Ligand binder design. Sequence first.
Ligand SMILES: O=P(O)(O)OC[C@H]1O[C@H](O)[C@@H](O)[C@@H](O)[C@@H]1O
Ligand SMILES: [Ca+2]
Length: 448
Amino acid sequence: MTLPAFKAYDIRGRVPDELNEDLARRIGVALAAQLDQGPVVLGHDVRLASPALQEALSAGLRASGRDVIDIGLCGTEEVYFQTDYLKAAGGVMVTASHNPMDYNGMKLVREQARPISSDTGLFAIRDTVAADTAAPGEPTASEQSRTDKTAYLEHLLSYVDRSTLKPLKLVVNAGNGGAGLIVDLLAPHLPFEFVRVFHEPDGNFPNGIPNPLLPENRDATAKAVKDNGADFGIAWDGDFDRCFFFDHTGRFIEGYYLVGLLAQAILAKQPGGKVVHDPRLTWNTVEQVEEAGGIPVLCKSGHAFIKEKMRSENAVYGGEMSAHHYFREFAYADSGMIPWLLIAELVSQSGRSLADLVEARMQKFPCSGEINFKVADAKASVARVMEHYASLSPELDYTDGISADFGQWRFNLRSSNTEPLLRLNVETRGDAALLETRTQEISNLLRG
Ligand SMILES: O=P(O)(O)OC[C@H]1O[C@H](O)[C@@H](O)[C@@H](O)[C@@H]1O
Ligand SMILES: [Ca+2]
């Protein structure tokens, strides 16, 4: 038995049996022993238990001599940004994404907001916490409240030339998470008219836990766009490190296509740079990056792998189709805010709608959408897929599960690192029929 809340990438579990104030305090103590010198930034999301868990983390950190910088209710990217900006030793964001109401969690970073993951400190914290029967000591360091968002907001706005922006009408859907607070702080500096949907932070989640991928939640943004004639819409998850785009027809744009589009937007500002992308869906990104004079860099999926590869490559931008977009000067971190500012600037400057910006790309590299499978035997199921296709001799790559490139179509098939699932992505060279027949064929094999 090990504490189940400790996952590969972060901590998450049901309160109070898998995560509670006692464990939170012990995590703070253990984190203090894992970090280089300096204070620790703490922030939390809108969930009802988040402040108390953060307080417990603070008590454990301060009992271990760490000054705490409490940045308050915020998004995950604000913990990243402030940890790096203030040159802190590390940071913790108290958040659970789209987990049930009785769940919470923590995302931990060290210096420069470098992720702490299972094999880079998180399981060391787990093992310390698991064995810690010490009496809780008393605080020896202090907590300061630092809710000034000025440097954060200036950083976000530095990505666009405000004088080129047009008064676009934008639907924004925080899903009752925290994104609306940042939208409202940016709004005085922008010419846009916002149509605010599910805007107020509310950890009771009266309109559902924030997950723009669920069709009922997707449709709320789509309807607001259509009914208001908005140029485009943006929705976020609760901690707003993920962003989801809807064109002026209400159509949700698959996150794959935002990677190539945002890469081109960044490459116009930082020419010739490297762009990091995941292996799930690739061909459109590679082509668009190259077309814009950048250099694409294939990387395993998962935010910590993306960030590490961006650092080693001095990459200007990285993007995953799972709705995460990473920016070198933003501490190599992901932001749910930078992407829509860039897209709004692109629409403003080009005179093209978001739909037009992506339409030809979606026709040229149609994709299945990510299809998930919980099967009895994942390894045997993957083996059945590969055995079926062996006679076509695809080019195989093992960066992240199995990528198989057949020429006019390819797939990526991999185990998720956040759920016990297999994830399938298929794309083709402009061939919707081949896309469907191969996707259904693989699905049948996986379910066999
Ligand atoms: O497909 P997976 O392995 O479940 O990860 C899905 C996503 O989970 C989180 O949102 C982040 O860690 C992302 O970096 C990752 O892409
Ligand atoms: Ca998130």
